[PDB]
Design a binder for these strands. Structure first.
Ligand SMILES: [Zn+2]
Ligand SMILES: [Zn+2]
Lengths: 65, 188, 49, 48, 49, 49, 94
DNA sequence: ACTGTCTGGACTGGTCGGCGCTATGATC
DNA sequence: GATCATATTGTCCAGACAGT
């Protein structure tokens, strides 16, 4: 439900640049160029960043205590 | 004019899926049953004649209330699917039927009594989640993506599976080669 | 292991893979002795019992 | 043998005795579903 | 589909020009008209109806 | 599929409600008969509601 | 690092190497291959789970030098090569 | 002696887990 | 309001059997 800290393949950290990538994608920018500008070269890290779906906000609304 | 591309037909298909949904048959069937099925059953039963001279009870209109549960203490509170699931309760609503007593052939003042509790299909017209937005469903502990269309019985979700039966009151002719006969069957 | 080039060009891609609920943690069952049925004096049925 | 519980809906603290409770409900909002709060003691969790 | 009352459909079919089965008996040159599997009448021009 | 009809949840619910209402009607008739036979005619007709 | 001798012939030495894996084992075998007095040199992992950190070796010489001496020269060659590569890397970085 | 008819029976093994169900009306 | 008797009586293959 939250972005993984590291890439599942090579362990490259991607969670720091995920929110900027999501913000730039929603602004109409090309996701490939945004990934290229963020240093995401290998397509495994691109797989991790592109295929992630954020769902933690939909879980926080239900309280468990 | 150029022929339509498959993208436009996909847009129309998506509009159909957005309008009706994916559990439409359950919701439509339950709404039809609630609107006139109970009244049809009551009318087909008609009346009850006990062993009392010159006395009978005539059935009137039947209505369904809001989904609520009566506590063991005595208080009556509205019921929600999450509460029914957690507390192992049945998501049902009371059923009220008007009874008109007939004495010596003259109808008396009708009396409305409770005849039982009928389980309520999720996201149906008789359900408390009908017409609610995503935020309202979230506030009630319900996932907005839940399609509904099922029943909660003693805290367990029960879904009715449709049965692919033959057409009622329809005659079909077939030939049995082994028995060397022609047989037509109807289900009345 | 060897570090040498493979003699054939290996097909590699990205495939959507799903993990199913059939896990070995819920399927491993080992019984030596324990409860038996009252009627038949035979071992019971099920990993839970 | 009293204990402190958290309400499921309102979330406020509810204190009652399970042994001698006539009714399990929240006195603030009337909810009959309560949550047992987590103990304040520390626990050790292995990082994978 | 969701069911609709059959009386309105039968009245509409009778109004549109379907001769009732009691008035006219079936003939080899006649088109049999069925409503929900029930023979309700006959018409001369089935295709037009 | 022209000869096949799908029994949805509404029809099964209607059949179950019919069976339950028949049982309730029989029980109500028996209760009314028993109360009339036990308490008497004066109690029954003094308050029919 | 622990050495457990399996068997010892007149010119054959079979032993285990606890605590090591393919990384050191392959390098040691290929360094032993460089010696002209070593006729057979090979390693294997019996099981990738139970024997993951315990490869099995087999060194056969021609009788001129002992297999233990051949392994010692191979290890010394590995040490010298690693030191030379480290020196070259340090020189190239600055 | 043939021939169609009535009746009885069995319906591949194992495993996983879930989900209900095992009283009621009439005195004293 | 507590207890007590009673609680209803699915096709196909093979063997045995009236009918002609
Ligand atoms: Zn990567
Ligand atoms: Zn509360």
């Amino acid at each position: 439900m939250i972005v993984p800290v590291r890439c599942f393949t090579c362990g490259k950290v991607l969670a720091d640049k995920y929110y900027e990538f999501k913000k730039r994608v929603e602004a109409g920018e090309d996701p490939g160029k945004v990934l290229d500008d963020l240093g995401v070269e290998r397509y495994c890290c691109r797989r991790t960043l592109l295929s992630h779906v954020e769902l933690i906000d939909q879980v926080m609304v239900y309280k468990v205590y | 004019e150029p022929t339509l591309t498959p993208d436009e037909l996909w847009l129309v298909m998506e509009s159909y899926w957005k309008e009706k949904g994916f559990v439409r048959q359950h919701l439509d069937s339950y709404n039809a049953f609630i609107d006139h099925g109970l009244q049809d059953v009551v009318n087909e039963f008609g009346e009850v004649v006990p062993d009392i001279p010159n006395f009978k009870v005539k059935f009137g209109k039947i209505r369904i209330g809001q989904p609520e549960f009566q506590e063991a203490q005595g208080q009556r509170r509205p019921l929600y699917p999450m509460d029914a699931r957690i507390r192992n309760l049945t998501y049902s609503a009371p059923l009220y039927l008007e009874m008109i007593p007939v004495v010596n052939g003259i109808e008396q003042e009708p009396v409305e009594v409770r005849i039982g509790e009928l389980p309520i299909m999720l996201k149906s017209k008789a359900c408390r989640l009908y017409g609610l937005s995503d935020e309202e469903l979230i506030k009630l502990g319900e996932d907005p993506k839940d399609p509904g269309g099922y029943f909660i019985i003693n805290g367990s979700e029960r879904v009715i599976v449709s049965i692919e039966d033959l057409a009622p009151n329809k005659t079909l002719v077939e030939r049995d080669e082994r028995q060397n006969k022609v047989v037509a069957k109807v289900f009345s | 292991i060897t570090g040498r080039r493979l003699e054939a060009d290996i097909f590699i891609g990205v495939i959507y893979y799903q993990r199913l609920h059939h896990m070995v943690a819920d399927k491993m069952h080992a019984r030596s002795r324990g409860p038996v049925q009252v009627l038949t004096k035979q071992p019971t049925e099920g990993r839970a019992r | 043998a009293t204990a402190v519980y958290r309400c499921a809906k309102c979330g406020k603290e509810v204190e009652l005795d399970l042994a001698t409770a006539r009714e399990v409900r929240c006195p603030y909002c009337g909810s009959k579903i309560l949550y047992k709060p987590r103990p304040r003691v520390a626990r050790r969790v292995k990082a994978i | 589909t969701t069911g609709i009352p059959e009386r309105e459909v039968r009245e509409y079919l009778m109004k549109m020009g379907v001769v009732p089965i009691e008035e006219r008996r079936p003939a080899p040159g006649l088109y049999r008209v069925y409503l929900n599997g029930v023979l309700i009448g006959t018409v001369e021009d089935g295709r037009k109806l | 599929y022209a000869n096949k009809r799908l029994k949805l949840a509404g029809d099964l619910l209607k059949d179950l409600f019919r069976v339950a209402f028949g049982q309730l009607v029989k029980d109500m008739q028996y209760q009314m008969t028993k109360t009339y036979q036990r308490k008497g005619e004066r109690y029954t007709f003094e308050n029919i509601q | 690092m622990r050495i457990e001798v399996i068997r010892r012939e007149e010119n054959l030495l079979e032993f285990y190497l606890e605590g090591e894996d393919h990384t050191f084992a392959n390098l040691l075998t290929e360094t032993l291959h460089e010696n002209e007095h070593v006729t057979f040199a090979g390693y294997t992992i019996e099981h990738p789970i139970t024997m993951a950190r315990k490869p099995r070796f087999k060194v056969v010489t021609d009788g001129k030098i002992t297999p233990e001496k051949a392994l010692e020269e191979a290890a010394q060659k590995i040490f010298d090569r690693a030191r030379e590569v480290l020196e070259a890397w340090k020189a190239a970085i600055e």
